[PDB]
Write a protein that binds this ligand. Structure first.
Ligand SMILES: CCN(c1ccc(Cl)cc1)S(=O)(=O)[C@@H]1C[C@@H]2O[C@H]1C(c1ccc(O)cc1)=C2c1ccc(O)cc1
Ligand SMILES: CCN(c1ccc(Cl)cc1)S(=O)(=O)[C@H]1C[C@H]2O[C@@H]1C(c1ccc(O)cc1)=C2c1ccc(O)cc1
Lengths: 10, 236, 226, 9
């Protein structure tokens, strides 16, 4: 689970 | 599902991109000029980590980017992030010939590059790019168009039509800016080409920089953040 | 010299300068290992380089440069130029790479496949855009002149940039002749030049993958990047 | 360099 996936979310 | 980005005028596109610009961040305030790999990369890794968070929130505000799936957004940022850091570096270094303004309080000369194995070669390439932008009198409005092109283009062939339509809109916007600046028709397409060819150069620098960051990782020289490690790992 | 040619004259010059398409030593009745297949491609690329050097001499502007600068540009660009040639002749072969008329491979042949997929993707992109032969030879000459220009006196570089401007003019000429509106011309110009960023990427990733038998000429071309 | 030489021919 990528950090970038979390950060791109609102 | 029609995208709002394609309905913007050239002036609205430029306004959107200017408004989305991240701030210029500072490095640490210790006066000591870095001359070792450890001190240099300590500062740069910290700066880049902070710039990445602003980059991610900048990308969300690039018209068209929001219309992509999360997976596609992830892929484009993974591909483009170092290119985007580098074009920003070259832009803010323009008015400092022979120097790289990593931050307002972190100005390096190539002498400091020579004190890091593998760095001077890229240093010189970045300097050459800055000088080229300066001699072309690159404008802020043009710069933000180019940075957005890097974001949308650098990962697009390793995945479609939506991204190409948005890219076309940014081309339109570049030409609009050049026409507004009074360039003749021939001058407009010549300048457009000049700018886009520099993007090949920026890709080249990013490729070589990425290899160096991997060498950095493997040597376990400086502590790397998990975000950086994941961004870097996307290029392995 | 190069700066006096009309657009049509520039296109004619580049078309007439085109290298031949060479054959490989592939034999369908012979088994090949990963080593011997690389050998085929090495042998092929090595022979292509000889034709590429003679082609470069016929690109308008190139002979005006010093020998040292001619060497630098070719060292920088040779793999990009092999690659764009490969992608061009693979256009009408969806899903495959036509290394030679007698050597057509798709992706399940590999061991590399990363580079192959990128080359395939580029070929598909060319096909979708319906890239024209006249556009292709312009793009290939841009690579030769552009790829090494920022890693080299200042006069030599200005002359290269003048020739690059003429090639841009030539591309726009071709698109106008094909009936594209001015907006379509500028858009297509940009589409084509952005593909050059991907071709640079592929060249660098290929070298990175190589860090394969190598000819004396290839060895020397390679050290230039290391 | 070989490239050097082939260019001179
Ligand atoms: C190791 C991977 N690659 C690579 C190989 C050799 C060198 Cl020197 C550099 C790169 S590649 O980039 O996949 C590289 C792209 C393509 O497939 C490899 C290769 C080649 C080239 C030279 C050679 O001696 C052996 C193979 C290719 C190739 C060969 C001939 C062409 O007209 C076009 C492309
Ligand atoms: C000359 C600069 N370059 C360079 C190349 C080779 C070596 Cl060995 C050292 C540096 S670079 O590739 O541009 C590039 C790699 C490294 O420096 C530059 C850089 C960088 C660039 C721009 C920016 O806004 C912030 C940082 C680096 C960086 C460092 C650590 C990170 O976690 C992330 C980025």
């Amino acid at each position: 689970h990528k950090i970038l996936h979390r950060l791109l979310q609102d | 599902k029609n995208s709002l980005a394609l309905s913007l005028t050239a002036d609205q596109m430029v306004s959107a991109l200017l408004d989305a610009e991240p701030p210029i961040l500072y490095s640490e305030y210790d006066p000591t000029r870095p001359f070792s790999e450890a001190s240099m990369m300590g500062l740069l890794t910290n700066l880049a980590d902070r710039e990445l968070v602003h980059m991610i929130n900048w990308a969300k505000r690039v018209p068209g980017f929001v219309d992509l799936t999360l997976h596609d957004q992830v892929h484009l940022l993974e591909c483009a992030w170092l290119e985007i850091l580098m074009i920003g570096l070259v832009w803010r270094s323009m008015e400092h010939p022979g120097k790289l303004l990593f931050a307002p309080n972190l100005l390096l000369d190539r002498n400091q590059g020579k004190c890091v194995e593998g760095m001077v070669e890229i240093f010189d390439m970045l300097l050459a790019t800055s000088s080229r932008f300066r001699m072309m009198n690159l404008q802020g409005e043009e710069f933000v168009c180019l940075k957005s092109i890097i974001l949308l283009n650098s990962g697009v062939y390793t995945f479609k039509d939506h991204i190409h339509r948005v890219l076309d809109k940014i081309t339109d916007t570049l030409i609009h800016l050049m026409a507004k600046a009074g360039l003749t028709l021939q001058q407009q397409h010549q300048r457009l080409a000049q700018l886009l060819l520099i993007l090949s150069h920026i890709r080249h620098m990013s490729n070589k920089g990425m290899e160096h960051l991997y060498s950095m990782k493997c040597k376990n020289v400086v502590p790397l953040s998990d975000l950086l490690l994941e961004m870097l790992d996307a290029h392995r």
